[PDB]
Coordinates of C-alpha atoms in Angstrom, one line a residue:
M15 CA 10.8 -20.5 141.2
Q16 CA 14.5 -21.3 140.7
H17 CA 15.1 -18.1 138.7
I18 CA 14.2 -15.9 141.7
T19 CA 16.2 -15.5 144.9
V20 CA 14.6 -16.6 148.1
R21 CA 14.5 -13.4 150.2
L22 CA 16.4 -13.4 153.5
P23 CA 13.9 -13.3 156.4
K24 CA 13.7 -9.9 158.1
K25 CA 14.5 -11.5 161.5
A26 CA 17.8 -12.7 160.1
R27 CA 18.5 -9.4 158.2
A28 CA 18.1 -7.2 161.3
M29 CA 20.7 -9.3 163.2
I30 CA 23.2 -9.4 160.3
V31 CA 23.0 -5.6 159.7
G32 CA 23.1 -5.1 163.4
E33 CA 26.4 -4.7 165.1
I34 CA 28.1 -8.1 165.4
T35 CA 29.0 -7.1 169.0
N36 CA 25.3 -7.3 170.0
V37 CA 25.4 -10.9 168.7
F38 CA 28.1 -11.9 171.2
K39 CA 27.8 -9.4 174.0
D40 CA 25.7 -11.7 176.1
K41 CA 25.8 -14.9 174.0
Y42 CA 29.5 -15.9 174.2
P43 CA 29.9 -15.4 178.0
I44 CA 26.6 -17.3 178.6
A45 CA 27.7 -20.2 176.3
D46 CA 31.1 -20.4 178.0
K47 CA 29.5 -20.5 181.4
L48 CA 27.0 -23.2 180.4
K49 CA 29.8 -25.6 179.6
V50 CA 29.9 -26.5 183.3
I51 CA 27.3 -25.7 185.9
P52 CA 26.4 -27.6 189.1
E53 CA 22.9 -28.3 187.7
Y54 CA 24.4 -30.9 185.4
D55 CA 25.8 -33.0 188.3
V56 CA 22.3 -33.0 189.9
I57 CA 20.8 -34.2 186.6
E58 CA 23.5 -36.9 186.3
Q59 CA 23.0 -38.1 189.8
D60 CA 19.2 -38.1 189.6
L61 CA 19.4 -40.0 186.4
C62 CA 21.6 -42.7 187.9
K63 CA 19.4 -43.0 191.0
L64 CA 16.3 -43.3 188.8
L65 CA 17.5 -45.9 186.3
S66 CA 20.0 -48.0 188.3
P67 CA 17.4 -50.0 190.3
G68 CA 15.8 -50.9 186.9
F69 CA 19.0 -52.5 185.5
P70 CA 20.5 -53.8 188.8
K71 CA 23.0 -56.2 187.3
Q72 CA 24.8 -53.8 184.9
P73 CA 27.2 -50.9 185.1
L74 CA 25.6 -47.5 184.5
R75 CA 27.4 -44.4 183.3
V76 CA 25.9 -41.1 182.1
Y77 CA 27.7 -39.0 179.5
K78 CA 26.5 -35.5 179.0
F79 CA 26.9 -33.8 175.6
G80 CA 25.5 -31.3 173.1
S81 CA 25.6 -27.6 172.6
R82 CA 25.7 -26.8 176.3
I83 CA 28.8 -29.0 176.8
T84 CA 30.7 -27.8 173.7
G85 CA 30.1 -24.1 174.4
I86 CA 27.5 -22.8 172.0
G87 CA 24.4 -23.2 174.2
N88 CA 22.0 -20.8 175.8
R89 CA 19.7 -20.9 178.8
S90 CA 16.9 -22.6 176.7
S91 CA 19.2 -25.3 175.3
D92 CA 18.4 -28.9 176.0
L93 CA 21.0 -31.2 177.6
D94 CA 21.9 -34.4 175.7
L95 CA 22.6 -37.4 177.9
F96 CA 23.9 -40.8 176.8
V97 CA 23.0 -43.5 179.3
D98 CA 25.3 -46.4 178.9
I99 CA 23.9 -49.5 180.6
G100 CA 26.0 -52.6 180.2
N101 CA 29.1 -51.3 178.4
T102 CA 27.4 -50.4 175.1
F103 CA 29.6 -47.4 174.4
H104 CA 31.6 -49.3 171.7
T105 CA 28.6 -50.8 169.9
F106 CA 27.5 -49.1 166.7
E107 CA 23.9 -49.3 165.5
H108 CA 23.0 -47.8 162.2
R109 CA 19.4 -48.2 163.0
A110 CA 18.5 -48.9 166.6
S111 CA 18.2 -52.6 167.4
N112 CA 15.2 -54.3 168.9
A113 CA 17.1 -54.6 172.2
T114 CA 17.9 -50.9 172.2
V115 CA 14.2 -50.0 171.5
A116 CA 13.2 -52.4 174.3
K117 CA 15.6 -50.6 176.7
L118 CA 14.3 -47.2 175.7
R119 CA 10.7 -48.3 176.2
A120 CA 11.5 -49.6 179.6
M121 CA 13.3 -46.4 180.6
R122 CA 10.2 -44.3 179.5
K123 CA 8.2 -45.8 182.3
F124 CA 10.7 -44.7 184.9
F125 CA 10.5 -41.0 183.8
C126 CA 6.8 -41.3 183.5
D127 CA 6.4 -42.6 187.1
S128 CA 9.0 -40.3 188.6
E129 CA 7.8 -37.0 190.2
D130 CA 11.2 -35.4 189.3
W131 CA 10.8 -35.9 185.6
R132 CA 8.2 -34.7 183.1
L133 CA 8.0 -36.9 180.0
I134 CA 7.8 -34.6 176.9
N135 CA 8.0 -37.1 174.1
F136 CA 9.1 -40.7 173.3
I137 CA 10.5 -40.7 169.8
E138 CA 11.0 -44.3 168.7
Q139 CA 11.1 -43.9 164.9
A140 CA 14.1 -41.5 164.8
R141 CA 17.5 -42.6 163.5
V142 CA 18.6 -42.1 167.1
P143 CA 15.6 -42.9 169.3
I144 CA 15.4 -40.5 172.3
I145 CA 13.4 -39.8 175.4
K146 CA 12.7 -36.1 175.7
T147 CA 12.1 -35.2 179.3
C148 CA 12.3 -32.2 181.6
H149 CA 14.3 -32.5 184.8
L150 CA 11.9 -30.7 187.1
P151 CA 14.3 -29.7 189.9
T152 CA 16.4 -27.7 187.4
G153 CA 13.9 -27.1 184.6
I154 CA 16.5 -28.3 182.0
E155 CA 15.1 -30.3 179.1
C156 CA 17.1 -33.5 178.6
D157 CA 17.3 -35.6 175.5
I158 CA 18.2 -39.2 176.6
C159 CA 19.7 -41.6 174.2
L160 CA 21.4 -45.0 174.1
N161 CA 24.0 -44.2 171.4
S162 CA 27.5 -43.0 172.1
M163 CA 28.2 -41.3 168.8
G164 CA 26.9 -37.8 169.7
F165 CA 29.0 -37.8 172.9
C166 CA 32.1 -38.7 170.8
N167 CA 31.2 -35.8 168.5
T168 CA 30.9 -33.4 171.4
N169 CA 34.4 -34.3 172.7
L170 CA 35.9 -33.6 169.2
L171 CA 34.1 -30.2 169.0
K172 CA 35.3 -29.3 172.5
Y173 CA 38.9 -29.9 171.4
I174 CA 38.4 -27.9 168.2
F175 CA 36.6 -25.0 170.0
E176 CA 39.1 -24.9 172.9
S177 CA 42.1 -25.0 170.5
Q178 CA 40.7 -22.4 168.1
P179 CA 38.0 -20.3 169.8
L180 CA 37.2 -18.4 166.5
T181 CA 35.4 -21.6 165.6
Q182 CA 33.2 -21.4 168.7
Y183 CA 32.3 -17.8 168.1
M184 CA 31.4 -18.6 164.4
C185 CA 29.3 -21.5 165.5
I186 CA 27.3 -19.4 168.0
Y187 CA 26.7 -16.9 165.2
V188 CA 25.6 -19.4 162.5
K189 CA 23.4 -21.3 165.0
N190 CA 21.5 -18.1 165.7
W191 CA 21.5 -17.3 162.0
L192 CA 19.9 -20.7 161.2
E193 CA 17.2 -20.1 163.8
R194 CA 16.3 -16.7 162.5
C195 CA 16.3 -18.0 159.0
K196 CA 13.9 -20.7 160.0
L197 CA 16.2 -23.3 158.4
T198 CA 16.6 -25.7 161.4
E199 CA 14.1 -28.3 160.0
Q200 CA 16.5 -28.9 157.2
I201 CA 20.0 -27.9 158.4
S202 CA 20.8 -28.7 162.0
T203 CA 23.2 -26.8 164.3
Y204 CA 25.6 -29.7 164.1
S205 CA 25.5 -29.7 160.3
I206 CA 26.5 -26.0 160.1
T207 CA 29.1 -26.6 162.8
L208 CA 30.8 -29.1 160.5
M209 CA 30.6 -26.6 157.7
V210 CA 32.3 -24.0 159.9
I211 CA 35.0 -26.6 160.7
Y212 CA 35.5 -27.5 157.1
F213 CA 35.7 -23.9 156.0
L214 CA 38.4 -23.2 158.7
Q215 CA 40.4 -26.3 157.7
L216 CA 40.6 -24.8 154.2
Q217 CA 42.2 -21.7 155.8
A218 CA 44.8 -23.9 157.6
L219 CA 43.2 -23.0 160.9
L220 CA 42.0 -26.5 161.9
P221 CA 43.5 -29.9 161.2
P222 CA 41.8 -32.6 159.1
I223 CA 40.3 -35.1 161.4
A224 CA 41.9 -37.9 159.5
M225 CA 45.3 -36.3 160.5
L226 CA 44.4 -36.6 164.2
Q227 CA 43.6 -40.4 163.8
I228 CA 46.8 -41.9 162.5
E229 CA 47.1 -45.5 163.7
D230 CA 50.7 -46.4 164.5
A231 CA 52.8 -47.8 167.3
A232 CA 52.1 -45.0 169.7
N233 CA 48.4 -44.4 168.8
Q234 CA 45.6 -47.0 168.7
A235 CA 42.0 -46.4 167.7
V236 CA 39.0 -46.4 170.1
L237 CA 36.4 -48.1 167.9
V238 CA 32.6 -47.8 168.1
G239 CA 31.7 -50.4 165.5
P240 CA 33.8 -49.5 162.5
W241 CA 34.2 -45.8 163.5
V242 CA 37.4 -44.3 165.0
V243 CA 36.0 -42.0 167.7
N244 CA 39.2 -40.8 169.5
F245 CA 41.9 -38.5 168.1
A246 CA 45.2 -37.2 169.2
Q247 CA 44.7 -34.1 171.2
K248 CA 47.8 -32.4 169.9
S249 CA 48.6 -28.8 170.6
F250 CA 48.1 -26.5 167.6
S251 CA 51.7 -25.4 168.3
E252 CA 52.8 -29.0 167.6
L253 CA 50.4 -29.2 164.6
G254 CA 51.9 -26.0 163.2
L255 CA 48.5 -24.2 163.1
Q256 CA 48.2 -20.6 164.3
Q257 CA 45.8 -19.8 167.1
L258 CA 43.9 -16.6 166.5
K259 CA 42.4 -14.3 169.1
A260 CA 38.8 -13.9 168.0
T261 CA 38.0 -10.2 167.9
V262 CA 34.8 -8.6 166.4
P263 CA 36.7 -7.6 163.2
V264 CA 38.3 -11.0 162.8
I265 CA 35.0 -12.7 163.4
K266 CA 33.1 -10.6 160.9
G267 CA 35.6 -11.2 158.1
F268 CA 35.6 -14.9 158.6
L269 CA 31.8 -14.9 158.7
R270 CA 31.7 -12.9 155.5
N271 CA 34.0 -15.4 153.8
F272 CA 32.1 -18.4 155.3
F273 CA 28.8 -17.3 153.8
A274 CA 30.4 -16.3 150.5
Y275 CA 32.1 -19.7 150.3
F276 CA 28.9 -21.7 150.8
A277 CA 26.9 -19.4 148.5
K278 CA 29.1 -20.5 145.6
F279 CA 29.9 -24.1 146.6
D280 CA 29.3 -26.7 144.0
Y281 CA 26.9 -29.1 145.9
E282 CA 26.4 -31.2 142.7
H283 CA 30.0 -32.5 142.6
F284 CA 31.6 -31.8 146.0
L285 CA 30.9 -32.5 149.7
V286 CA 31.7 -30.8 152.9
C287 CA 34.3 -33.2 154.3
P288 CA 36.0 -32.3 157.7
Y289 CA 37.4 -35.9 157.7
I290 CA 39.7 -35.0 154.8
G291 CA 39.9 -31.3 155.4
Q292 CA 41.0 -30.3 151.9
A293 CA 39.3 -28.3 149.1
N294 CA 37.2 -29.9 146.4
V295 CA 36.5 -33.4 147.8
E296 CA 34.5 -35.1 145.1
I297 CA 31.3 -37.0 145.7
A298 CA 32.5 -39.4 143.0
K299 CA 35.6 -40.2 144.9
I300 CA 34.9 -40.0 148.7
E301 CA 34.0 -43.6 149.3
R302 CA 37.4 -44.8 148.0
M303 CA 39.2 -42.3 150.3
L304 CA 38.0 -43.6 153.6
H305 CA 39.6 -46.0 156.0
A306 CA 39.5 -49.7 155.3
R307 CA 37.0 -50.3 158.0
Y308 CA 34.5 -48.2 156.1
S309 CA 34.9 -50.4 153.0
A310 CA 34.6 -53.6 155.1
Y311 CA 31.5 -52.3 156.9
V312 CA 29.7 -51.3 153.7
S313 CA 30.8 -54.5 152.0
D314 CA 29.1 -56.5 154.7
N315 CA 26.2 -53.9 154.9
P316 CA 25.6 -52.4 151.4
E317 CA 22.4 -50.6 152.6
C318 CA 24.5 -48.6 155.1
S319 CA 26.8 -46.6 152.8
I320 CA 26.9 -42.8 152.9
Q321 CA 23.9 -41.2 151.1
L322 CA 25.5 -39.4 148.2
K323 CA 22.6 -39.1 145.8
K324 CA 21.3 -36.0 147.7
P325 CA 21.3 -32.3 147.0
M326 CA 23.6 -31.5 149.9
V327 CA 26.3 -33.8 151.3
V328 CA 28.0 -32.9 154.6
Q329 CA 29.9 -35.9 156.0
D330 CA 30.2 -36.6 159.7
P331 CA 34.0 -36.9 160.3
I332 CA 33.6 -39.8 162.7
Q333 CA 30.5 -41.7 161.5
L334 CA 31.7 -41.6 158.0
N335 CA 28.6 -43.2 156.5
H336 CA 26.4 -40.3 157.7
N337 CA 25.5 -37.5 155.4
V338 CA 24.1 -35.2 158.1
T339 CA 22.3 -33.1 155.5
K340 CA 20.6 -36.0 153.7
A341 CA 17.2 -34.5 154.4
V342 CA 17.9 -31.2 152.6
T343 CA 15.7 -30.8 149.5
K344 CA 16.6 -29.1 146.3
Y345 CA 14.5 -26.1 147.3
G346 CA 15.9 -26.2 150.8
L347 CA 19.4 -26.1 149.4
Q348 CA 18.5 -23.2 147.1
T349 CA 17.1 -21.4 150.1
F350 CA 20.3 -21.9 152.1
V351 CA 22.4 -20.8 149.2
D352 CA 20.4 -17.7 148.6
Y353 CA 20.5 -16.8 152.3
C354 CA 24.2 -17.3 152.3
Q355 CA 24.6 -15.0 149.3
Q356 CA 22.5 -12.2 150.9
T357 CA 24.2 -12.5 154.2
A358 CA 27.7 -12.3 152.8
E359 CA 26.6 -9.2 150.9
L360 CA 25.3 -7.6 154.1
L361 CA 28.6 -8.3 155.9
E362 CA 30.7 -6.5 153.4
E363 CA 32.6 -3.3 154.5

């Protein structure tokens, strides 16, 4: 029923009307602490010990990433691990290749046989196939992949969150909001993180990612396939962006404005575009605004262009052909919009 608002779930409502301090009192210090704990070194070492014998002629490196590493995790969060066997970091796979699937299938057996690991699921169909497994000595659930792109995203978020901590507080809040709204099947934590980033770029509080990726005499791209995955780690002082101290009042006001903005966004004509970082980025124009490697990649691979004929378009700022909200349905978008509207209303002073 499109003429009736979807009602905000009571689990979300109680948290929104509740003091925002309660949101963070335990959550931010926990998330900060979980960026680095000694358990992760045990996991990394155990993973290398387990898998190295099985790939004895190749270099092996483990890259940890995800919400724990960026600073928005909690004690139940999974740890994402990219296992790079044979210098595959710089190889881009739109859909996993046969050779990648074969490596993942071989790795599954190691976790299966090992007493130190419980195999939870082997997810082969996914866009990013993963092994979900529990590291039993620590009890931390680990998502093992063979794709470097999520790790690259994590390093960009770390820079963003460390430079402008308001972003981190906002992302902790909206992650919890998504969960209480029961929206995570359609809108991921990473998708709403990119929405927070884009919103703050419009406030001149974060740089466009394209700005951080100028290719000139002093700066060369790190490429994963056609994607530029590095960025200049410029101080915000040098970028001319102010660095705010996140207080409860500042956070609440930015959250109010965030939800109001996405309640009234025109998803039919515009996309959320942290690459460009400017207002009103048109769906009709975005593909002509990307770097030349995007055009060359899609020219050679026309089935791999960004999916724009979708209710909700949120573009990954590194993997520019990925609409991270491509699975949002018309009703799912209406639900999100209605929840944003009601949340902004409840955050008014």
